[PDB]
Amino acid sequence: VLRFGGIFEYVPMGAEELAFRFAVNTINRNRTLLPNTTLTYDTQKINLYDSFEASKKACDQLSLGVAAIFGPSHSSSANAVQSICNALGVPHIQTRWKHQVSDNKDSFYVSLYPDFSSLSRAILDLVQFFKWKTVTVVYDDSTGLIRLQELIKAPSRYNLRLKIRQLPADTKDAKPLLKEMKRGKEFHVIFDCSHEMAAGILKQALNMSMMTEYYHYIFTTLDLFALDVEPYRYSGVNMTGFRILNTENTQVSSIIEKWSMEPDSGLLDGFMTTDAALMYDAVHVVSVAVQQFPQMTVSSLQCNRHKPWRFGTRFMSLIKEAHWEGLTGRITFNKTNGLRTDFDLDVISLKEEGLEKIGTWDPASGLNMTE
Amino acid sequence: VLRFGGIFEMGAEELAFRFAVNTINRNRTLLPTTLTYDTQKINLYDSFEASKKACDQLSLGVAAIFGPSHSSSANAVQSICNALGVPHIQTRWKHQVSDNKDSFYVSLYPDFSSLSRAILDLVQFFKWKTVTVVYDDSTGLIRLQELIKAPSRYNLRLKIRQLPDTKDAKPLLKEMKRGKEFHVIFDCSHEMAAGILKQALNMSMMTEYYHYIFTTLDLFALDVEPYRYSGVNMTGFRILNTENTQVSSIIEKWSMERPDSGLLDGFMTTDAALMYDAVHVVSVAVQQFPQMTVSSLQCNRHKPWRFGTRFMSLIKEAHWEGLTGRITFNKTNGLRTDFDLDVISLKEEGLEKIGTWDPASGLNMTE
Ligand SMILES: *[C@@H]1O[C@H](CO)[C@@H](O)[C@H](O)[C@H]1NC(C)=O
Ligand SMILES: *[C@@H]1O[C@H](CO)[C@@H](O)[C@H](O)[C@H]1NC(C)=O
Ligand SMILES: *[C@@H]1O[C@H](CO)[C@@H](O)[C@H](O)[C@H]1NC(C)=O
Ligand SMILES: *[C@@H]1O[C@H](CO)[C@@H](O)[C@H](O)[C@H]1NC(C)=O
Ligand SMILES: *[C@@H]1O[C@H](CO)[C@@H](O)[C@H](O)[C@H]1NC(C)=O
Ligand SMILES: *[C@@H]1O[C@H](CO)[C@@H](O)[C@H](O)[C@H]1NC(C)=O
């Protein structure tokens, strides 16, 4: 019997927090996992973008005695708990993308979120398939540039002429930006934002008769198809994106169901995000690591009192090597970056019947289209 | 008599800090009071060690911490400073976040959105149609983003590359030479720059066809001797007013205290000059607040700093003529968005001021 850690936003409850609890409870029930063990956990609710509070709440979970911390979903917060985890030798489990640094030499952490250099290369692979010559990439926050940088420096190695814009704070302030694209005849567009931001801008692009067949939008969000695309079914507009969540598999469909069993924004109700799906998978991927390490026993470690974690290098090694078929498909880590650089995607596009798989992608095979 | 804080990777910023408080002590005009300080040497890119060393300086009792010169390290001490209400003094650019609501901090480094707008103002003056922007690390994209999204509002067609090893820049140079990319912007440290110029030279890439612009403000602490009569054009900016002799003599007694790399020996970087100015800009704030007294504050024991909101207010309002010119802060971002630059270019006599710039006036060229 051992304990896990968790840090989530403070507020109604969070979707990642529920995917975490729900995950350890189905690990308890399921015989195959922990036939001689039981998962308990400790939840901490911190105000995000607060490195200090995240570090303290982290140290409280460390003295309490955890085998791994599932840190916050933010840049600053996650970097703090990542450094504390690397110091005291306790594994850090990130479920989102954060800006990494070459200088940084932390090793006690892994990220289940699909390496975003693989996704940027999948996007341009999709632009190659569409034979696009021009394209306007519009991002939400500045980190978007660091994210899909492999796409930004394609025009230098390729024959591409892409403009690049950004949208302000207000959601509905996207109309002026849309006026400039409409006016600039920029029909091929990539959007770097959350599926919520996306559903919001599509509702405005619609008001600006911008949903014709001339336009073709690609989306960064993997939760693209948790969107109510009903209003744009027969508008003639094309839309494409990726999906790492294998909802095609019924095992995944039933898990998503018992999870959803527990407003007019444009989103569909009763859906599981990839952030929630990645937290659920994280719990399972670390459960298979501890499964191969029956001699595990948490320990009370203090931040002020320097003291590495006993079974750290061993546990972290079993985690970076773990291969697990989860909701998001085959899960494996780049031995160098402990970063998930190899994964399977399903390219999907809007049709007159709705969004549907038109092919697959992956860093290896490249781009396979079911013509 | 009060104490200051400092965190560094001896270093040039650390010496500019000590040197700064010692000249504040000597100089009558300031502290007619005495400055003592506490130095901490942390391994950079270590949020944890930076937070602990910071809390040790907080319990010790400081009036302000001059945090580390890194993203992660500076964000940690920035959050701790905002919590315990002690002013944070950053001297470099770090990626800021809209969500972040910390207020106890200011950055003397010139707002990099003003510099990105000065760069394109320079590209407008040169009437460049094409241009290849090559950055060093990924944060460069976030930095000069105001330039990257110019092609959408303007008539510009700029490529964009990244460099990996210093000497591994040759393949990148082959692609530019081959792609006829003569107009080039470089986003890197003056050390990286001096290194790539030495290679561009070996590749007969220093002709009059090429024209390089540089992000580094320490551009002209470079040995540009080998490219004097090569015919190549080179341009950059300078916020350090070495033209002013007061600044020239300070830089001198500084270089009196402390390899074939392409750099010039005995120079003061803008990072060191900004630390020196920081100490003075915060000294003028405490000068207008004689009722100041440091306090021992604990991290585990929540307790804001008494004269925090007041001190931080006197600092964000402080106007000070320093080594880097007039220093003032954007009331909203506590970020130095208004400053004076001196555009400089390589001639047959060497680098020299060919004009000035600033967010207000725009671009003034001494034709
Ligand atoms: C679109 O939005 C405008 C306001 O921006 C509103 O006045 C108009 O009724 C809308 N047009 C339609 C028919 O959707
Ligand atoms: C692992 O990381 C290296 C270096 O970033 C990268 O080149 C490689 O593609 C990654 N591994 C895989 C198979 O994705
Ligand atoms: C440039 O570098 C090459 C390879 O090291 C060297 O052989 C050559 O002499 C250099 N060019 C000159 C003229 O210095
Ligand atoms: C560089 O400067 C000289 C000054 O005479 C100018 O004639 C030339 O056009 C410039 N080089 C470029 C980039 O054209
Ligand atoms: C401060 O920054 C804002 C952008 O955040 C800018 O619009 C404003 O002009 C700056 N303050 C002034 C008036 O100098
Ligand atoms: C242009 O520079 C001159 C000095 O050469 C300066 O006196 C003048 O104020 C500048 N013009 C303006 C106001 O932009």
Curated annotation (Swiss-Prot), chain B:
Tissue: Highest expression is found in the olfactory lobe, piriform cortex, dentate gyrus, hippocampus, granular cell layer of the cerebellum, and in caudate-putamen.
Intrachain S-S bonds: 55-299
Subcellular location: Cell membrane; Postsynaptic cell membrane
UniProt modification remark: Sumoylation mediates kainate receptor-mediated endocytosis and regulates synaptic transmission. Sumoylation is enhanced by PIAS3 and desumoylated by SENP1.
Record: glycosylation sites: 27, 233, 330, 364
Stretches of the chain found on the membrane's Extracellular side: 1-367
Assembly description: Homotetramer and heterotetramer with GRIK5. Tetramers may be formed by the dimerization of dimers. Assembles into a kainate-gated homomeric channel that does not bind AMPA. Can form functional heteromeric receptors with GRIK4 and GRIK5. Can form functional heteromeric receptors with GRIK3. Interacts with DLG4. Interacts with NETO2. Interacts (via C-terminus) with KLHL17 (via kelch repeats); the interaction targets GRIK2 for degradation via ubiquitin-proteasome pathway.
Miscellaneous comment text of the record: The postsynaptic actions of Glu are mediated by a variety of receptors that are named according to their selective agonists. This receptor binds domoate > kainate > quisqualate > glutamate. It does not bind AMPA without coexpression with GRIK5.
Protein function: Ionotropic glutamate receptor that functions as a cation-permeable ligand-gated ion channel, gated by L-glutamate and the glutamatergic agonist kainic acid. L-glutamate acts as an excitatory neurotransmitter at many synapses in the central nervous system. Binding of the excitatory neurotransmitter L-glutamate induces a conformation change, leading to the opening of the cation channel, and thereby converts the chemical signal to an electrical impulse. The receptor then desensitizes rapidly and enters a transient inactive state, characterized by the presence of bound agonist. Independent of its ionotropic glutamate receptor activity, acts as a thermoreceptor conferring sensitivity to cold temperatures. Functions in dorsal root ganglion neurons.
Family in the record: Belongs to the glutamate-gated ion channel (TC 1.A.10.1) family. GRIK2 subfamily.
Protein name, UniProt field: Glutamate receptor ionotropic, kainate 2
Source organism of this protein record: Rattus norvegicus
Gene: Grik2
